[PDB]
A paper describes a structure:
L351A/W356A is a secondary-binding-site mutation that targets both subsites M and L, while F184A targets the target lysine access channel at the active site. The F184A mutant was also crystallized with the [name] peptide, but no peptide is found in either the substrate binding site or the secondary binding site, suggesting that this mutation also disrupts binding at both sites. Phe184, together with the two other aromatic residues Tyr240 and Tyr258, forms the target lysine access channel. Mutating Phe184 to the smaller alanine (F184A) widens this channel significantly. In the wild-type structure, the target lysine fits snugly within the channel. The mutation likely disrupts this precise fit, leading to the loss of binding. Despite no peptide being identified, the secondary binding site contains PEG-like electron densities. The results showed that the peptide binds in a 2:1 ratio with the wild-type protein, which changes to 1:1 with the F184A mutation. In contrast, the F184A mutation at the target lysine access channel abolishes the methyltransferase activity of [name] on all tested substrates, even though these substrates, except for the [name] peptide, can still bind to the mutant.
Author numbering: 5 to 432
Amino acid sequence: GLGGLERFCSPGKGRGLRALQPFQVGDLLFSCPAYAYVLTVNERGNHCEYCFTRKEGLSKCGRCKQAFYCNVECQKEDWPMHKLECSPMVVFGENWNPSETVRLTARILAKQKIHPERTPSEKLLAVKEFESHLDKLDNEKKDLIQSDIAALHHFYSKHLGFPDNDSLVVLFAQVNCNGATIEDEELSHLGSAIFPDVALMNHSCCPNVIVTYKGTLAEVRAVQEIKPGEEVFTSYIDLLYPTEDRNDRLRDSYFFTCECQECTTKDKDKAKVEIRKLSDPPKAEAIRDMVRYARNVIEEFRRAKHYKSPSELLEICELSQEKMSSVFEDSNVYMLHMMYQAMGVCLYMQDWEGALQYGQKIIKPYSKHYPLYSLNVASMWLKLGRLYMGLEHKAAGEKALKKAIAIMEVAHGKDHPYISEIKQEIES
Ligand SMILES: Nc1ncnc2c1ncn2[C@@H]1O[C@H](CSCC[C@H](N)C(=O)O)[C@@H](O)[C@H]1O
Ligand SMILES: [Zn+2]
Ligand SMILES: [Zn+2]
Ligand SMILES: [Zn+2]
């Protein structure tokens, strides 16, 4: 398996990963090549399909004209997977729209068909041993999975010999509980992948490691000191939100309730739900009313941004901030949430000054709500630094970039290509 590590049975968590030797903050616990992976549609042309390297002047697949490569070698290496989509993409035309989960599952089945034996990605845990939580799925969940299976048959029937329906349901549930989004240095979505050895790690809201990505390779580095015998815990979710929100998401997606220190004590929750200390104290029921409102408007915005204009979205953020502010301080995570969304739609609108203005009032609370080494914090420092540099505020830009580097050296490793790029952006 992996030196200095050991698969074991973690009480109340099923199987987990334990350390057999000490690891210091920044040490590399291990690296894991992707078992199967797929680049998200919106990043085609920016990244190489095979190795995920970002560069300009990628070779275009002459066949489908929708898959870009470093060279003919990367193209050849990606052909066993790319042929699943090359011709269907041109035949279906505009009707080709499988969800990313379907694309990934199709590549999983292909990888099992050609490489049925244990891969180097499965040193400690094989794909077939994945947890499915089949018995927990309600009818709504089952019907969503059945819709994905229907799409799988619809777009990938010519190249894959499919197992029976039951097995496909198990596979999709396993993907939903073990899949891994790949994000860039600004936590922008690059694609989805299966990292069997990485999936073994259980969740904690105070994790001791962070998973970063070097192309299609997952790397796992410590963000706290790990001693022999201690279990290795990563985070599955955004840690910004209070305990009940986190466990709502964990129950919904992974079907378990977390009992880590943050969940048991809920101490940071008080900072996260900051109430204005005004002459008139809000009553508890008014607080809970505004909290419910906040959680509702967050979901409403997730929906609205698919069919609404950017300015309409900014209006939603501005109006919700005013209403919520009557009760919530600006450091409240629901205010920060709407500020972050406003920053994103301003970034899309290319209003760099506006987005910078929002980002400035986001990093101060962000830094304290998130753990010491957090990719969310690093990415915010990086976005800020790049806006500063773009608007020629070099002094403040360099400051922000160094803060990002300080966290990334730990999480990504000091020799990571991203850090080289950022140091170039300081010297240029
Ligand atoms: N902190 C935690 N408490 C209880 N169960 C957890 C947990 N973190 C992860 N899990 C379990 O692990 C699943 C994710 S895959 C992680 C490995 C899994 N424990 C296994 O034996 O294969 C979750 O769906 C949940 O069932
Ligand atoms: Zn490449
Ligand atoms: Zn093609
Ligand atoms: Zn927790």
